[PDB]
Amino acid sequence: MNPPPPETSNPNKPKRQTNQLQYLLRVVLKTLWKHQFAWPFQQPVDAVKLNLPDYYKIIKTPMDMGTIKKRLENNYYWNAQECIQDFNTMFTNCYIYNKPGDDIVLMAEALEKLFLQKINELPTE
Ligand SMILES: Cc1cc(C)cc(Nc2nccc(-c3c(-c4ccc(C(F)(F)F)cc4)ncn3C3CCN(CCN(C)C)CC3)n2)c1
């Protein structure tokens, strides 16, 4: 079975809007979402449908851009570093589960290169 997706709304978690979090949603997430290679990363890994019975035996901290989108739009994050961490967790999950040079890994690496280019332009708080 698939696990439930990560929490994206918490009424007990304090909320904040910052110029950096706005940039992460309106620039970073939007740009990665529209990339030709984004489609495997736009939702939780459906290990049942994809026939990956071991995915959630290996990946105990799942993450994906659909979850990141919801977290951003819900003001789930207090600081930009939490969101940057979620992107990095997503990429690392892909690398852990697969092998260097795999198609999906080349796709993730291209997305990560673009992500890092956009983070280098993160505005000061
Ligand atoms: C290239 C390609 C080819 C095909 C046919 C379909 C897809 N679609 C797709 N959709 C969602 C996840 C993945 C995916 C991820 C993966 C891991 C972590 C994340 C992250 F980052 F979100 F966490 C994101 C993604 N890892 C491997 N796959 C593939 C590898 C190839 N298999 C083929 C069948 N296999 C049983 C042998 C299917 C799963 N692939 C992609």
From Swiss-Prot:
Belongs to the BET family. The NET domain mediates interaction with a number of chromatin proteins involved in transcription regulation (NSD3, JMJD6, CHD4, GLTSCR1 and ATAD5). This is Bromodomain-containing protein 4. It is linked to Cornelia de Lange syndrome 6: A form of Cornelia de Lange syndrome, a clinically heterogeneous developmental disorder associated with malformations affecting multiple systems. It is characterized by facial dysmorphisms, abnormal hands and feet, growth delay, cognitive retardation, hirsutism, gastroesophageal dysfunction and cardiac, ophthalmologic and genitourinary anomalies. CDLS6 inheritance is autosomal dominant. A chromosomal aberration involving BRD4 is found in a rare, aggressive, and lethal carcinoma arising in midline organs of young people. Translocation t(15;19)(q14;p13) with NUTM1 which produces a BRD4-NUTM1 fusion protein. The gene is BRD4. It is found in: Nucleus; Chromosome. Chromatin reader protein that recognizes and binds acetylated histones and plays a key role in transmission of epigenetic memory across cell divisions and transcription regulation. Remains associated with acetylated chromatin throughout the entire cell cycle and provides epigenetic memory for postmitotic G1 gene transcription by preserving acetylated chromatin status and maintaining high-order chromatin structure. During interphase, plays a key role in regulating the transcription of signal-inducible genes by associating with the P-TEFb complex and recruiting it to promoters. Phosphorylation by CK2 disrupt the intramolecular binding between the bromo domain 2 and the NPS region and promotes binding between the NPS and the BID regions, leading to activate the protein and promote binding to acetylated histones. In absence of phosphorylation, BRD4 does not localize to p53/TP53 target gene promoters, phosphorylation promoting recruitment to p53/TP53 target promoters. Interacts with p53/TP53; the interaction is direct. Interacts (via CTD region) with CDK9 and CCNT1, acting as an associated component of P-TEFb complex. Interacts with RELA (when acetylated at 'Lys-310'). Interacts (via NET domain) with NSD3, CHD4, BICRA and ATAD5. The interaction with BICRA bridges BRD4 to the GBAF complex. Interacts (via NET domain) with JMJD6 (via JmjC and N-terminal domains); the interaction is stronger in presence of ssRNA and recruits JMJD6 on distal enhancers. Interacts with NSD3. Interacts with NIPBL. JQ1, a thieno-triazolo-1,4-diazepine derivative, and I-BET, a benzodiazepine derivative, have been tested on tumors with success. Treatment with GSK1210151A (I-BET151, a I-BET derivative) has strong effets on mixed lineage leukemia and promotes myeloid differentiation and leukemia stem-cell depletion. The chain holds residues 44 to 167 of 1362 of the full protein. The record marks N98 as: Acetylated histone binding. Residues 16-122 form the Bromo domain. Transmembrane segments: none annotated. There is a cross-link at K57 (Glycyl lysine isopeptide (Lys-Gly) (interchain with G-Cter in SUMO2)). It comes from the Eukaryota. Ubiquitously expressed.
